Amino acid sequence: MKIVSWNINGIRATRVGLKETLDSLDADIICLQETKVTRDLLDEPSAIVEGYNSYFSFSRVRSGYSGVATFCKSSTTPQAAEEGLSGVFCTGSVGCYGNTEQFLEEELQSLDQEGRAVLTQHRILNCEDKEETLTVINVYCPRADPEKPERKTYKLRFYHLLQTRAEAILQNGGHVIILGDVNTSHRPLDHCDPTDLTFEENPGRQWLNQFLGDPSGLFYDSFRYFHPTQKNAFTCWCSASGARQTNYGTRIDYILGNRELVESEFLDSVIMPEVEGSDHCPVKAFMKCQPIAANKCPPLCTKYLPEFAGRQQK
Numbered sequence: 001m002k003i004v005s006w007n008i009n010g011i012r013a014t015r016v017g018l019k020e021t022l023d024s025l026d027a028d029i030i031c032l033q034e035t036k037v038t039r040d041l042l043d044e045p046s047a048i049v050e051g052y053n054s055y056f057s058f059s060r061v062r063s064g065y066s067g068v069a070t071f072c073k074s075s076t077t078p079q080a081a082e083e084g085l086s087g088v089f090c091t092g093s094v095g096c097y098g099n100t101e102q103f104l105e106e107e108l109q110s111l112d113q114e115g116r117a118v119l120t121q122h123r124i125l126n127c128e129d130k131e132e133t134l135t136v137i138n139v140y141c142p143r144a145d146p147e148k149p150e151r152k153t154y155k156l157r158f159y160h161l162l163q164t165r166a167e168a169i170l171q172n173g174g175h176v177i178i179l180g181d182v183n184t185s186h187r188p189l190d191h192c193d194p195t196d197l198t199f200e201e202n203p204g205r206q207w208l209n210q211f212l213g214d215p216s217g218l219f220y221d222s223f224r225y226f227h228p229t230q231k232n233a234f235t236c237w238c239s240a241s242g243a244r245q246t247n248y249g250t251r252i253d254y255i256l257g258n259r260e261l262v263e264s265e266f267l268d269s270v271i272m273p274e275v276e277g278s279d280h281c282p283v284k285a286f287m288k289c290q291p292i293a294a295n296k297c298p299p300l301c302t303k304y305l306p307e308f309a310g311r312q313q314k
């Protein structure tokens with residue numbers, strides 16, 4: 001089983017047909033961040049691709065903004081799928097929300113209305129050939145903006161909601177992968193030199209430090225489980241001033257898994273710097289577990305969107 005995560009900086013902006021791009025990534029589950037697809041655009045070619053069943057979260061606050069999508073081959077059709085981390089935009093859902101007493105409902109709506117998370121749940125056969133659930137949480141984390149101070153708070157609250165949800169699903173049994181653009185690099189090795197000699201003072205990095213365990217947190221950074229000392233392993237370079245060529249970059253795209261999943265089912269986790277078309281490159285994991293496809297796509301699937309019903313229904 002193979003899974004890819006990629007902040008694609010706009011599906012359309014790659015200027016390649018999406019079927020060709022997805023096939024080239026050669027994976028059973030492909031998670032895209034910053035699709036820049038919103039529902040007002042009626043962008044059927046970006047949402048419905050031959051050979052895949054897909055699950056989008058669309059931003060509700062601005063056209064052509066944010067957005068995440070999970071594309072599944074027939075082999076991995078999910079048993080359940082849900083938009084968001086809190087449940088407010090939710091048959092066929094994932095549940096297991098955790099305790100959100102610290103969040104107002106209106107804050108939950110705000111954290112979930114920007115198209116930043118989609119969850120798909122897959123049955124898998126583990127290394128003892130027992131059936132288990134794997135929940136894939138595909139996230140595009142926000143960014144702080146100095147001219148809008150409230151967005152730093154938004155980002156930290158999004159991280160706290162993500163932790164709450166992921167740990168609650170994990171507590172229900174089975175396995176959890178969190179992948180996507182976390183928009184924080186973890187350790188000095190993850191960023192171009194030189195490094196702060198207060199590096200831990202960053203509140204997003206403090207969050208990551210306690211969320212991840214080291215082979216206290218319940219999740220492992222799979223890339224570093226397999227490549228703990230690899231240098232210059234970046235996933236993001238700014239578009240300007242030749243950064244990708246000079247390796248002026250950072251590693252901010254992750255495939256995180258619960259400890260038991262990474263230790264027992266992962267074979268490798270890598271960076272794909274050869275893949276062009278975005279300001280980020282993909283990351284990819286290779287797993288030994290085998291998926292059990294659902295018999296029907298759950299209701300979140302894009303094929304059920306009324307705007308895409310087709311001419312025969314017209």
Ligand SMILES: [Mg+2]
Pocket residue numbers: 009010034279
């Ligand atoms: Mg971008």
